[PDB]
Design a binder for these strands. Structure first.
Ligand SMILES: [K+]
Ligand SMILES: [K+]
Ligand SMILES: [K+]
Ligand SMILES: [K+]
Ligand SMILES: [K+]
Ligand SMILES: [K+]
Ligand SMILES: [K+]
Ligand SMILES: [K+]
Ligand SMILES: [K+]
Ligand SMILES: [K+]
Ligand SMILES: [K+]
Ligand SMILES: [K+]
Ligand SMILES: [K+]
Ligand SMILES: [K+]
Ligand SMILES: [K+]
Ligand SMILES: [K+]
Ligand SMILES: [K+]
Ligand SMILES: [K+]
Ligand SMILES: [K+]
Ligand SMILES: [K+]
Ligand SMILES: [K+]
Ligand SMILES: [K+]
Ligand SMILES: [K+]
Ligand SMILES: [K+]
Ligand SMILES: [K+]
Ligand SMILES: [K+]
Ligand SMILES: [K+]
Ligand SMILES: [K+]
Ligand SMILES: [Mg+2]
Ligand SMILES: [Mg+2]
Ligand SMILES: [Mg+2]
Ligand SMILES: [Mg+2]
Ligand SMILES: [Mg+2]
Ligand SMILES: [Mg+2]
Ligand SMILES: [Mg+2]
Ligand SMILES: [Mg+2]
Ligand SMILES: [Mg+2]
Ligand SMILES: [Mg+2]
Ligand SMILES: [Mg+2]
Ligand SMILES: [Mg+2]
Ligand SMILES: [Mg+2]
Ligand SMILES: [Mg+2]
Ligand SMILES: [Mg+2]
Ligand SMILES: [Mg+2]
Ligand SMILES: [Mg+2]
Ligand SMILES: [Mg+2]
Ligand SMILES: [Mg+2]
Ligand SMILES: [Mg+2]
Ligand SMILES: [Mg+2]
Ligand SMILES: [Mg+2]
Ligand SMILES: [Mg+2]
Ligand SMILES: [Mg+2]
Ligand SMILES: [Mg+2]
Ligand SMILES: [Mg+2]
Ligand SMILES: [Mg+2]
Ligand SMILES: [Mg+2]
Ligand SMILES: [Mg+2]
Ligand SMILES: [Mg+2]
Ligand SMILES: [Mg+2]
Ligand SMILES: [Mg+2]
Ligand SMILES: [Mg+2]
Ligand SMILES: [Mg+2]
Ligand SMILES: [Mg+2]
Ligand SMILES: [Mg+2]
Lengths: 38, 77, 46
RNA sequence: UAAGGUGAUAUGAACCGUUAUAACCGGCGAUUUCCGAAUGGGGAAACCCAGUGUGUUUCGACACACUAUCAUUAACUGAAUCCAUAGGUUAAUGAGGCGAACCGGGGGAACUGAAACAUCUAAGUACCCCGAGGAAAAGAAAUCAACCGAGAUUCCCCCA
RNA sequence: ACAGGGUGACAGCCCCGUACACAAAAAUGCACAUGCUGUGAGCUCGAUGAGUAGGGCGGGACACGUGGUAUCCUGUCUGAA
RNA sequence: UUUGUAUAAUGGGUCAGCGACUUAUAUUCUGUAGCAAGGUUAACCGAAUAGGGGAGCCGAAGGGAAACCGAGUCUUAACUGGGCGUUAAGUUGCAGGGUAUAGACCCGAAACCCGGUGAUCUAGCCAUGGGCAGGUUGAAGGUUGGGUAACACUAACUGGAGGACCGAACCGACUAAUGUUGAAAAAUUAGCGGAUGACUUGUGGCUGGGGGUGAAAGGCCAAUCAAACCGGGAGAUAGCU
RNA sequence: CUGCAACUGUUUAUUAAAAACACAGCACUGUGCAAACACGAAAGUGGACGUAUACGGUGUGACGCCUGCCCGGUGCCGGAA
RNA sequence: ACUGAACAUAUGUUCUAACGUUGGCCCGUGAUCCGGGUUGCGGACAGUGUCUGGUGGGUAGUUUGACUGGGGCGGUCUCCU
């Protein structure tokens, strides 16, 4: 799943970076926390 | 009922077939799971009973778009 | 000797009466069949 | 429309009528107990028991009308929890039940045949379920054809 | 008008009918005519259906039993232009 | 029905009425009629048993797996060969014989499957009520006296235990006789077992058919049980009578 | 005098009441609780408002004296290089 | 597949955010259901779907020849002299 980061996430990247994460990581953590978006 | 709220997937019947081609009736069930979805717009979690396939659809179309389709079909959540 | 039919009106009505028949779809099918055939007496109900 | 008649058993009793409110026939109305989806609650169908509001009262009581559920919409209200949402209340609109066949869909046998029997058959038949209509369903080519062409669906006769 | 029924036996002319010609205060069906309200046709410029087609696995429907087996449907896992 | 029946093998008390080779479509053969190298139309149109409609079907050519060739063709490198063909009768009705598919001459299983109806009988359980004349026996415990360092132990009284005893009601059902087209589709008579209990009984409730329930007999589940009853698949199938 | 069953019970409604079934007692075994197990496409419910001195399954069948040898076969339990 | 993240060397440990909870408390609420909330405990395990090997009289459909001095048992079943 391709996501756009809205925050500095460790071993991933910084704000405004497109990165490919496992869907579960995005779906269940990054997005609901607000650390990323699609 | 074992029905996916997103896709409408439900149990379908078919056969088991032996090596000797004996047919016995069986069902194929959808891969259903209850999942809490974060609805960013409404600042809340919504629980849907969805197939794994339905979860891929939600990823692609977004939950807001999918919830609209549910409201159109008149399926509560 | 004690025979099989031992009447109780309460039991009769509860087992076979109109309201027992109306309680289930199969009971309602009994009434439909009996109406269709044109029975004078639909049930044991008196 | 009429000289007879008030349905029959059915005899008579009391009557009605004969030139047009006798009767009879047709259109439109009125009345339409109780049970039954049955819907105010309940219930062993044709019964038991209410609430609310209007009146009325000779203070004994009486009459009438409302009062189901669910869906949808709207309004108002409203938790945990700050917003909110869930929930709650009221209103409006609709639904439910029945029905011989025909129709679409969800499920779906076995006997039987195969001279046994398991693939296969019977048969997607019987049957159960849901839905719908006067019909239903199907339908306007990501279809065929064969280098020529045809031009949605359905039904009938061929092809066989 | 000899369809038919009835009448004390098997009736064209006894009765009721039949052929044929007529009929509606009222309600109502249908076909045309015409008021009114809603309706957007036509033209121009665009747009052209994605968890989809296709695929793997398991089944099903196609006359076709998976077979060398096309095409269709999809429970499961994927996935274009 | 049989090799064979007066047979003491089967069936029929008698009479009257009813009761078994059908129907549809396809196919082949025979008869018959029409037309004839042709014959005939289907659906449909038509008010038309007419007429239209020749889409088709059968026939006038076969040989070869086939391409293909064609009064020939196949086989073979090729036939002196050999196989199948070549000498005009077909076709459409109508009637009939047979075959095919259908219940297919009629009647008849035991069964299988599907949907319902049943626990008013009975099995188990659940709740709530009731019943058990009369007579016996005499557990534990206790008291008092004896006895012990204190216990222990011991006699009498008291006490009232028990799937305890005898025996009616009540519940059963061991024996015999009777009855066996019964008084009765399970009883009567004389005896018999239990009878304060793992007892018995009333009322209501729950469990449902490959299911229940079973102190277990395949017992019982409405006089029905190695798979209830009713309706349906259904005219199952029957190389048998 | 003796067989069988310890005993009271239970059973083939309608040809069997028994030596059959049950039984207290015994043993093996499963089960740590959302228990095993059972009914149920499921939700649930029984087990149990119990908790290993408990619950389920299996065999044996009061009590007395006892219950020998065999783990090759079949099962079960355990190991895993 | 639902199903994620670190770290060390496919395997382990740690983590929380999916998921579970038949722990506690709060609310809907007059409620041992259910849902929501808060929190704890488990935690990418468990569990469910599809696929797959094993096991599987627990259940189902069936099969289990003929001759024969009755049947069974025995013998025989095709070919040659
Ligand atoms: K009513
Ligand atoms: K079969
Ligand atoms: K056969
Ligand atoms: K057979
Ligand atoms: K005469
Ligand atoms: K006449
Ligand atoms: K796909
Ligand atoms: K004979
Ligand atoms: K005889
Ligand atoms: K014929
Ligand atoms: K002929
Ligand atoms: K030749
Ligand atoms: K001829
Ligand atoms: K026949
Ligand atoms: K009772
Ligand atoms: K049965
Ligand atoms: K019965
Ligand atoms: K003895
Ligand atoms: K003994
Ligand atoms: K006895
Ligand atoms: K027994
Ligand atoms: K051994
Ligand atoms: K062993
Ligand atoms: K939690
Ligand atoms: K897992
Ligand atoms: K088995
Ligand atoms: K012989
Ligand atoms: K002999
Ligand atoms: Mg009511
Ligand atoms: Mg009422
Ligand atoms: Mg009441
Ligand atoms: Mg057969
Ligand atoms: Mg209508
Ligand atoms: Mg339509
Ligand atoms: Mg006469
Ligand atoms: Mg395609
Ligand atoms: Mg596909
Ligand atoms: Mg393909
Ligand atoms: Mg496939
Ligand atoms: Mg003889
Ligand atoms: Mg003779
Ligand atoms: Mg004689
Ligand atoms: Mg004779
Ligand atoms: Mg005979
Ligand atoms: Mg005779
Ligand atoms: Mg030819
Ligand atoms: Mg006693
Ligand atoms: Mg008895
Ligand atoms: Mg007696
Ligand atoms: Mg006694
Ligand atoms: Mg036996
Ligand atoms: Mg019986
Ligand atoms: Mg059976
Ligand atoms: Mg049949
Ligand atoms: Mg028959
Ligand atoms: Mg002896
Ligand atoms: Mg005994
Ligand atoms: Mg005894
Ligand atoms: Mg007996
Ligand atoms: Mg006896
Ligand atoms: Mg024993
Ligand atoms: Mg078997
Ligand atoms: Mg069979
Ligand atoms: Mg033989």
């Amino acid at each position: 799943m391709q996501v756009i980061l809205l925050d500095k996430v460790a071993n991933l990247g910084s704000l405004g970076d497109q990165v490919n994460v496992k869907a579960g990581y995005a779906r269940n953590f990054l997005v609901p926390q607000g650390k990323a978006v699609p | 009922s074992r029905v996916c709220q997103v896709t409408g997937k439900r149990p379908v019947t078919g056969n088991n077939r032996s090596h000797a081609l004996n047919a016995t009736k069986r069902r194929f069930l959808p891969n259903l799971h209850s999942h809490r979805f974060w609805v960013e717009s409404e600042k809340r979690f919504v629980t849907l009973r969805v197939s794994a396939k339905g979860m891929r659809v939600i990823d692609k179309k977004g939950i807001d778009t999918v919830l609209a389709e549910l409201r159109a079909r008149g399926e509560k959540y | 000797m004690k025979r099989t039919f031992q009447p109780s009106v309460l039991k009769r009505n509860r087992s076979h009466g109109f309201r027992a028949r109306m309680a289930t779809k199969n009971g309602r099918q009994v009434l439909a069949r009996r109406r269709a055939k044109g029975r004078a007496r639909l049930t044991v109900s008196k």
